[PDB]
Structure formats: structure tokens, C-alpha cells
Design a protein around this motif. Structure first.
Motif, short mmCIF file in Angstrom:
data_model
loop_
_atom_site.label_atom_id
_atom_site.label_comp_id
_atom_site.label_asym_id
_atom_site.label_seq_id
_atom_site.Cartn_x
_atom_site.Cartn_y
_atom_site.Cartn_z
N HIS A 19 -5.61 -5.42 9.59
CA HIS A 19 -5.33 -4.54 8.45
C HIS A 19 -5.81 -5.13 7.12
O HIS A 19 -6.08 -4.39 6.17
CB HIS A 19 -3.84 -4.24 8.36
CG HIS A 19 -3.04 -5.39 7.84
ND1 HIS A 19 -2.64 -6.44 8.64
CD2 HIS A 19 -2.61 -5.69 6.59
CE1 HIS A 19 -1.97 -7.32 7.92
NE2 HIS A 19 -1.94 -6.88 6.67
N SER A 22 -9.02 -3.81 5.76
CA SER A 22 -9.04 -2.40 5.38
C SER A 22 -9.55 -2.24 3.95
O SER A 22 -9.33 -3.11 3.11
CB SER A 22 -7.65 -1.77 5.51
OG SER A 22 -7.60 -0.49 4.90
N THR A 23 -10.23 -1.13 3.68
CA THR A 23 -10.78 -0.90 2.35
C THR A 23 -10.30 0.43 1.78
O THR A 23 -9.69 0.47 0.70
CB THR A 23 -12.32 -0.95 2.37
OG1 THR A 23 -12.81 -0.34 3.57
CG2 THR A 23 -12.79 -2.39 2.33
N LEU A 24 -10.58 1.52 2.49
CA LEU A 24 -10.13 2.85 2.09
C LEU A 24 -8.60 2.95 2.03
O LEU A 24 -7.89 2.17 2.68
CB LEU A 24 -10.69 3.89 3.04
CG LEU A 24 -12.22 3.94 3.00
CD1 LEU A 24 -12.78 4.95 3.99
CD2 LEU A 24 -12.69 4.22 1.57
N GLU A 25 -8.09 3.90 1.25
CA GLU A 25 -6.65 3.98 1.06
C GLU A 25 -6.00 5.06 1.94
O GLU A 25 -6.69 5.97 2.42
CB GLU A 25 -6.31 4.20 -0.42
CG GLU A 25 -6.86 5.47 -1.04
CD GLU A 25 -6.69 5.48 -2.55
OE1 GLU A 25 -6.50 4.39 -3.13
OE2 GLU A 25 -6.73 6.57 -3.15
N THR A 26 -4.68 4.93 2.14
CA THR A 26 -3.93 5.74 3.11
C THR A 26 -3.35 7.04 2.54
O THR A 26 -3.10 7.98 3.29
CB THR A 26 -2.73 4.97 3.73
OG1 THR A 26 -1.79 4.61 2.70
CG2 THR A 26 -3.18 3.72 4.47
N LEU A 390 0.74 0.43 13.24
CA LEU A 390 0.33 0.32 11.85
C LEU A 390 -0.89 1.19 11.61
O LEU A 390 -1.86 1.15 12.40
CB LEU A 390 0.03 -1.12 11.49
CG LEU A 390 1.26 -2.02 11.44
CD1 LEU A 390 0.84 -3.48 11.40
CD2 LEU A 390 2.11 -1.67 10.23
N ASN A 391 -0.86 1.98 10.53
CA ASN A 391 -1.99 2.86 10.26
C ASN A 391 -2.72 2.48 8.98
O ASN A 391 -2.13 2.33 7.90
CB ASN A 391 -1.57 4.33 10.19
CG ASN A 391 -2.77 5.26 10.21
OD1 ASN A 391 -3.79 4.91 10.77
ND2 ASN A 391 -2.65 6.42 9.59
N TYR A 392 -4.04 2.33 9.13
CA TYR A 392 -4.89 1.95 8.03
C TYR A 392 -6.34 2.33 8.33
O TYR A 392 -6.71 2.59 9.49
CB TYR A 392 -4.77 0.45 7.75
CG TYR A 392 -4.90 -0.45 8.97
CD1 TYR A 392 -6.14 -0.95 9.37
CD2 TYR A 392 -3.78 -0.82 9.70
CE1 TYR A 392 -6.26 -1.78 10.48
CE2 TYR A 392 -3.89 -1.64 10.81
CZ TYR A 392 -5.12 -2.13 11.20
OH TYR A 392 -5.21 -2.97 12.30
#
Ligand code: HEM
Ligand code: HEM
Ligand SMILES: CN[C@H](C)Cc1cc(C#N)cc(OCc2ccc3c(C)cc(N)nc3c2)c1
Ligand SMILES: CN[C@H](C)Cc1cc(C#N)cc(OCc2ccc3c(C)cc(N)nc3c2)c1
Ligand SMILES: C[C@H](O)[C@H](O)[C@H]1CNc2nc(N)[nH]c(=O)c2N1
Ligand SMILES: C[C@H](O)[C@H](O)[C@H]1CNc2nc(N)[nH]c(=O)c2N1
Ligand SMILES: [Zn+2]
Lengths: 410, 411
Positions: A19, A22-26, A390-392
Motif C-alpha cells: 500500500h 500507492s499513488t492515486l487517491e481513494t 485493504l483497498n488502495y
């Protein structure tokens, strides 16, 4: 910062570090979780190069040549092409990698255990809707494989600057028509009523049935899109029968074997592929629970229970639940009887947990959207229900994009 | 900021402003969603702002915001905090507080009922025996011979954290679980650890499949004590199936009153560590989770066997078929015995109505989709297609560590 997820059925604990890449937002914040929201202009030169570097960095790491001359060379090579042409082209190898990893990173897909066995069709030399049709027929025939389905994606030329977009206007390559009817209700598929109409409003002659395979509406280089009929011999369908209720046949249901989503955008190293139909094979609940029983769809629950003569007087008889199960038993029975690839929700969710533990092991994690991964029936008797996730957002990725008819300069 | 949610089945769109009143944190960031994570000593310093916001809310609700009664109460609370380092709630404030902790519980599908909570003030309680008496009365009142009534009993608030009141049971009524030498489990696997503690504390276990656990009650920070709930207060329902006569022979039953007793009630910064509350069951709680979870009674196989299902391949959906029947039986048994229960279709429909009503009058309704959607037949219930916003409002119910992990033993 090095997060842990627990499975509460088995007490298995996995540790997530992926995670951090990760770059983009949720769409979530410290004060509010948007995890159940369905949906939360060109790239400039300065925008594009870090995106390209990020991608090439992960590509050359994956082939264990991070920090090699070949790596540094390719980095150099792309950077100069960007400043020159204000875009760049992927090598075939990177294209294939990018596509496989966009499936891999699809946090909403339960079927990702298969992610590396994706057949990638390079259609970047395409120039016309007729060309697109040809590539799509070849995709359909290859993927279908006489019922022995094979995962596949076909990738059309990348957006240049919104003016020359390639688009498949259909949401799936194969879907049934939906017709308004003067009576009141809807014949065929309600989800497709607008598109069914835009086809006619474009020039399609509808048979006005309940299972009319929609024509393809194909847009090349930003021109007005064109209608094409898929050769029926390429469209594999399954008559739906129940293994114990003879009367089930008489309902007149069928469905198509090939789920091929065609309205999404594939992002690889900053480049945008607005036309990239991809396909795998169905989980039974997709058809039997959602397509047949969503009130906003074929909504056949009432009629099935009626034929089972269940007590529909009160909700607490659970007649809906009982019928829902029979329907899904039938879908699975039918596909399997016809040797058409399908997977039940117990098998797929079990496969996914194994995939999760694989990804945590060899990759350090697996982005996963519980709200979509848990099947639409019998959730808690499947193992993903008790699985913390976990989500990303990782890239390369599949992204939503506007419907073309709201955008296209006609 | 305004925030919209869409029901994708009905295209109904609602606008949330209430999230702006959210204080606490979710666990999520802009780069990670922890929406499916189960779980994501207070001084005079931080207490008066917490009290003030509560009292501002309270007096707004009774249309007396900025009144002399409001300002005097603020002053009165201030001085009491400065002087005693804590403060006491008026009865009216307590009742308001407990109802709104329920109203704010984003994981609760049953909140349409939030305003009808019966609140029992047990803040004069001082001993475990006193706790037992209050709880017996709660159980009798709540049970009402099958005509269930929501209720909460509130024991004294935490002070220095060394004198806590705690109910050591996770619910007031639960069945014992016994680990056997051969690795099998007798009774409710969910309660094996608590069962063991009871036995160590001197409980004489019957060692059957449905033994009602004793109450283990802790008052003012002392060692917990064992009490047996009088059996005539424990209403149980034998489970049978409307069409399957062999079902009764599985020997199953369940209790009528769900009463959660391990959570912490927070009101105006005050912490009530013993606050058992109860309502009535949604069928799937028993029929799906309690009976069919692999880590619970796990009767799916036995039921499937007796239905003579194809249990070879999972794609026969014998699991799904058995589950539906078990849940039919649970509803059938409770209704037949005139014990309050609600099916998941009725409850989720009610919740949507409640949620819409809350957006209209309150500007929002915090909701946790992951918990609100039922554990079976998800998408044929209307909450599945309903987008939801999750955020944390106070007053609230919070989780707290099991007492046997923190308690300092007196002897
Ligand atoms: C091969 C077997 C596959 C199975 C069983 C499967 C299953 C599923 C299911 C059940 C969903 C839930 C979506 C819904 O309910 O509408 C989903 C979502 C998704 N799948 Fe897979 N899938 C498969 C293959 C693939 C492939 C080959 C790709 C792309 C290369 C893919 C990409 C996606 C994406 C991007 C989503 C979510 C899109 C969104 O955000 O709405 N899947 N999948
Ligand atoms: C009266 C009928 C009620 C029904 C049908 C109902 C239903 C439910 C259900 C199904 C859950 C999900 C829990 C699980 O699956 O483990 C839940 C959670 C919850 N309920 Fe309700 N409930 C009711 C009354 C109440 C009352 C009276 C209170 C408090 C005064 C309450 C507070 C809560 C809280 C705090 C949770 C969250 C627990 C957690 O976060 O783990 N409920 N409810
Ligand atoms: C009514 N709910 C809507 C249709 C949600 C949805 C929207 C979009 C888009 N755009 C794309 C979607 O695709 C999900 C998906 C994508 C690919 C799949 C493949 C390749 C196989 C499969 N069995 N299911 C899929 C399911 C879903
Ligand atoms: C194994 N899964 C665990 C038990 C989840 C859970 C934990 C806790 C705690 N602490 C409290 C919980 O409470 C849920 C709850 C609380 C109150 C309820 C009431 C009042 C009525 C009802 N029908 N269900 C409830 C359900 C749940
Ligand atoms: C991992 C997951 O968050 C966990 O199993 C949750 C999911 N949703 C739930 N929903 C309800 N109503 N009750 C539960 O215990 C859970 N468990
Ligand atoms: C409102 C909610 O987000 C919406 O109905 C989601 C819920 N989960 C889903 N899960 C899957 N697999 N597919 C869906 O279309 C949806 N829809
Ligand atoms: Zn979130």
C-alpha cells in the motif's frame, strides 16, 4: 504504517507493505469513509514523464534488471521521445506487462488468481471501425474457444489528445437489448434501454425480442461511431434449465457465455487506452443473482417463486431467498451441462483467498474492495466475508470513463 | 461541503451535511480505505470541550440553545470539572445521550427504533450483587414474555480507570463452549475462552450443548463475581422447521433476547464501561452467523445431509440451500412462539426508510455498508444498492478490551 489484515474465521494475519507504493487517491478521508460509493483533458509533458519513469522502474524491477544499462537506456529513450512528440509508445513487452498488472491491481475483481495468464491482443495498428470490428470478432472467437473460455484483452490506439479517441460504445461486447414498451414495463434488459435506443436512434433495426444480441457501436479516431452485427455463430449462449424442475425450461431464459467489458479505460505509464475490451468467464451469481433478480433488471424472482408455489404472502417465508438459490443452481447446471466455463461463488472466493495469501507472500499485499469481492448471495458462508481487506489504488489500472454519447463531438 | 449518495436501484439521491459535525477519525486516509477492518485514563484538560459540545447538542435538541438554562448548566459543569476533575449528567442528559449513541451507531441496521429506548439509571449501584439485581430487572423488563422491548442499563462512569464497572460477558445471555481433549468443541465455539474463565472462577459447568453462561460482574474495580440468572427469566425458543419434521431432532434452540454487554458508552467525554443494551434479533444473526459460521455451531453439513443434498460438488449450492432452510426454521420457531423477531428483508427495508428520514431531518445518517448488508441474499435486500457514508459521531458506543486482559487482580 506497515498494516496488518486479519481473517476472523481462521485467525490468519497478513502484513501489507504494498500500500505504500500507492499513488492515486481513494476518495476516503480521516473523517469519512466512502468505501461503498460506486464512483469516486490530456497529459502534459511534465505530467507524463514521472508516470513513465514510475512504470519503467517497476517493469525493469520485475524482469530483475533494475539499474541496468538496458533500464537506463530505455529510460533515456522514452524521456527524449516525450519531450519530442509530447507522448510515447510502449514496447510490446511493456504493453503486455502493463495489461496483466492492470488486472492484477483491480481491487474489485475476485478472479485475479488468473491474472498472469492473460492473452494480450495488440490492436494499436487499427485505424477504422471496420478494423475494430475485425479485431473484436477475433477476440470473441479466441476467448470463447468453443466454450473453453480463455482470458483476453484487445488494446486499440492510445488517446492522443481527446480529439482522436477510440471507443467501444457498448458496455459489454455481448449484451441483450432493452425496449421501452407502451404498456409500462420493459422487455429484454432494462439496464440497456438507453443504449438499445441509441442504436436504433443511430439506425439499428431491432427484432424487439427479450434476448436480442445488441449490435456493436464502434468509434475509431474520434469519428462518428458505426453499427456492426457480431456473427451469431461467434455468440455462444446457454439455455437455462434446472436439474430437478422440468418447468424451469419453459421460462425461456438463456444467457451468453462471454463476459467482455468494453467501456473502461486502461492506464499504463501515463498513457490512456480508451478502447480496451477485456474478457474472462462468469461467476454464476453475476447472472443468476444480479442479471436475473435485480429489480432494476430481468427481475424474474416473483415468477419463479410463483411456479414453485412458495408462500409469497410474507417476506419472512424467505421465498425470495429460496427461489434465488434455485435460480443460481440452474445457471451453474446449464453452463456446466454445455461444457461452458463458469465458476460458482464458493470456488472463486476460495481461489481468491489463496491468491491473496500468494500476493502477500510474493508481493507484500493485494488491494481488495470487500464491498465488491463478497458475493451478492450467501456472503458469510464464503471465506472472503471474514477476510479483512485493504483497498488502495495501484497503477497500471482499469478506470471508469464517461459514456461517449455524453461527450462525443457529434 | 455537501455530499451525495445514490441508490442505484431507485436512482434516489440524498445530500449529507451531517458529516461536517464528525469529530472522531475513521481509520481511512486518502490513500487507503480500511472499510473492512473489524477494529480500527482521561484528564480534566480535554474534558470540558467534550462536555460543552455535548451540552450544546443537548440544548439545541430541546430548543433551548443559548438560554439561561443552557449557560448556567455550562457554568455548573465547568466548575464541577475544575473542582472534581469530572462531572455528573442530569437524568435527561443521560437518556438523550444513550438514545443518540444508538442513533449514531453506523453498523446498526435496527436504528429506526432509536427513539424508543428504555433507559435504566444504575449509576447508584456499588456492588456486584447490586449489578446482578439491575441486570435481572433489565432482562425481565426487556423480555416482556416474548414481546421484546429495547433497553439499556447504565452503571457508574469511569473515574480514574482503576475503579471500573464491567460486565465480563460479551452478552447477558450466551451458551457455554467447551473444548474437548479430542479437539472437538461442545456448545458455542465463540464462548470457549469466557467459559473457561467462569469455570476457573468456580462455576460448575453442566457441560451440555446449550448451557446458559453465568454472569461475571465487576463493580468499582474489584474482582468479578459469579451469579446465575434465574432460569425463568431466560426465554428460549426450540428451533423447528415448518415442513421438515426431522429438524426438531437436531436438538437446537436459541435465546430470545440479544443483549450486548461488553461495549463502552461515551457521552460528553464521560465513559460508561458497563452499559448492557438489548433489542430483538434479526433472524440471520442466529440462522446465518450463530448456526452456520464455520467457527460457530456449524450445522450446515448435518442439515444438508438430512435434506439429502449433493454435497460432493460445491457448485450444487447445497450450502446455500441448507442455509435458507435453517433461516426459515429460525423465523418460523420465533413467530410460532410469539417471540419478537424480524427477517432481513423487513429490517433492511425499514432501515432505508429510516435513513432517508434521517437525511431529511438531520442532514445525514452515518452507515457502515459492510455491516448493514445482511450476511445472506445481500443484493435482493434494498440496502445493497444503497450508497452510504461512514463517519463517527458522539455520543457513541465504542469497543473496549476484554477485561481479563487489563484487570489487576486483588485476590
Ligand atoms: C477470468 C475470470 C474472472 C472472473 C470470475 C471475474 C469476476 C469478477 C466479478 C464477479 C466482478 C464483480 C463486478 C460485478 O459484479 O459487476 C469483477 C470485477 C472486475 N473485474 Fe474481474 N473477473 C474475471 C476476469 C477478469 C479479467 C480478465 C479482467 C481484465 C483483464 C478483469 C477485470 C475486472 C475489473 C476492472 C473489475 C471491476 C471494474 C469496476 O470497478 O467496476 N476481470 N470481476
Ligand atoms: C431493536 C432491534 C435491533 C436490531 C434488529 C439490531 C440489529 C443489529 C445487527 C444485525 C447488527 C450487526 C451485528 C452483527 O451482525 O454482529 C447490529 C449492530 C449494532 N447495534 Fe443494533 N439492533 C437492534 C437494537 C439495538 C439497540 C437497542 C442498540 C443500543 C442501544 C444497538 C446498538 C448496536 C451497536 C452499537 C452495533 C455495532 C456493534 C459493533 O460495532 O460491533 N442496537 N444491530
Ligand atoms: C450494474 N453494475 C455496473 C455494471 C458496475 C460495473 C460498471 C463498469 C463500468 N464501466 C464495469 C463493470 O465491470 C465489472 C466486471 C468487469 C470485467 C469482468 C470480467 C472480465 C469477467 C467477469 N466474470 N466479470 C466482470 C465484471 C461493472
Ligand atoms: C463475532 N462477531 C463479534 C461478536 C462482533 C461484535 C462485537 C461486539 C463487541 N464488542 C459487539 C457486537 O454487537 C453487535 C450487536 C450489538 C447489539 C445488538 C442488539 C442490541 C440487537 C441485535 N439484534 N443485534 C445486536 C448486535 C458485535
Ligand atoms: C472482515 C469483515 O470486516 C468482518 O468479517 C465483518 C464483515 N461484516 C460484518 N457484518 C455484520 N453484520 N457482522 C459481522 O460480524 C461482520 N463481520
Ligand atoms: C451501493 C453499492 O456500492 C453498490 O450496490 C455496489 C455494492 N457491491 C457491488 N458488488 C459487486 N460485485 N458488483 C456491484 O455492482 C456492486 N454494487
Ligand atoms: Zn474508507
Amino acid at each position: 504504517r506497515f498494516l496488518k489484515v486479519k481473517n476472523w474465521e481462521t485467525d490468519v494475519v497478513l502484513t501489507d507493505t504494498l500500500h505504500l507504493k500507492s499513488t492515486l487517491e481513494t476518495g476516503c478521508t480521516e473523517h469519512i469513509c466512502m468505501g461503498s460509493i460506486m464512483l469516486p483533458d490530456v497529459r502534459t509533458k511534465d505530467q507524463l514523464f514521472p508516470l513513465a519513469k514510475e512504470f519503467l522502474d517497476q517493469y525493469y524491477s520485475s524482469i530483475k534488471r533494475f539499474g541496468s544499462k538496458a533500464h537506463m537506456d530505455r529510460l533515456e529513450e522514452v524521456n527524449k521521445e516525450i519531450e519530442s512528440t509530447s507522448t510515447y509508445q510502449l514496447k510490446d513487452t511493456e504493453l503486455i506487462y502493463g495489461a496483466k498488472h492492470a488486472w492484477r491491481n483491480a481491487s474489485r475483481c475476485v478472479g485475479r488468481i488468473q491474472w498472469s495468464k492473460l492473452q494480450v491482443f495488440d490492436a494499436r495498428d487499427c485505424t477504422t471501425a471496420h478494423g475494430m470490428f475485425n479485431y473484436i470478432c477475433n477476440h470473441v472467437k479466441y476467448a470463447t474457444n468453443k466454450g473453453n473460455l480463455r482470458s483476453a484483452i484487445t488494446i486499440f490506439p492510445q488517446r492522443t489528445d481527446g480529439k482522436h479517441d477510440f471507443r467501444v460504445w457498448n458496455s459489454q461486447l455481448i449484451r441483450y437489448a432493452g425496449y421501452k414498451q407502451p404498456d409500462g414495463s420493459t422487455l429484454g434488459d432494462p439496464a440497456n434501454v438507453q443504449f438499445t435506443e441509441i442504436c436504433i436512434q443511430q439506425g439499428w433495426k431491432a427484432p424487439r425480442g427479450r434476448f436480442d444480441v445488441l449490435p456493436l457501436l464502434l468509434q475509431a479516431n474520434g469519428n462518428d461511431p458505426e453499427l456492426f452485427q457480431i456473427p451469431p455463430e461467434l455468440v455462444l449462449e446457454v439455455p437455462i434449465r434446472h436439474p430437478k424442475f422440468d418447468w424451469f425450461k419453459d421460462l425461456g431464459l438463456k444467457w451468453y457465455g462471454l463476459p467482455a467489458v468494453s467501456n473502461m479505460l486502461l492506464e499504463i505509464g501515463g498513457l490512456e487506452f480508451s478502447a480496451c475490451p477485456f474478457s474472462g468467464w462468469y461467476m454464476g451469481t453475476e447472472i443468476g443473482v444480479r442479471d436475473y433478480c435485480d429489480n432494476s433488471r430481468y427481475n424474474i424472482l416473483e415468477e419463479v417463486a410463483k411456479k414453485m408455489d412458495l408462500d409469497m404472502r410474507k417476506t419472512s417465508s424467505l421465498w425470495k431467498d429460496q427461489a434465488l438459490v434455485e435460480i443460481n443452481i440452474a445457471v451453474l447446471y446449464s453452463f456446466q451441462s454445455d461444457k461452458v466455463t463458469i465458476v460458482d461463488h464458493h470456488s472463486a472466493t476460495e481461489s481468491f483467498i489463496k491468491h491473496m495469501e500468494n500476493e502477500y507472500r510474493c508481493r507484500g499485499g493485494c488491494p481488495a474492495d470487500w464491498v465488491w469481492i463478497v458475493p451478492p448471495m450467501s456472503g458469510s458462508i464464503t471465506p472472503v466475508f471474514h477476510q479483512e481487506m485493504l483497498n488502495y489504488r495501484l497503477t497500471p489500472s482499469f478506470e471508469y470513463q464517461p459514456d461517449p454519447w455524453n461527450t462525443h463531438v457529434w
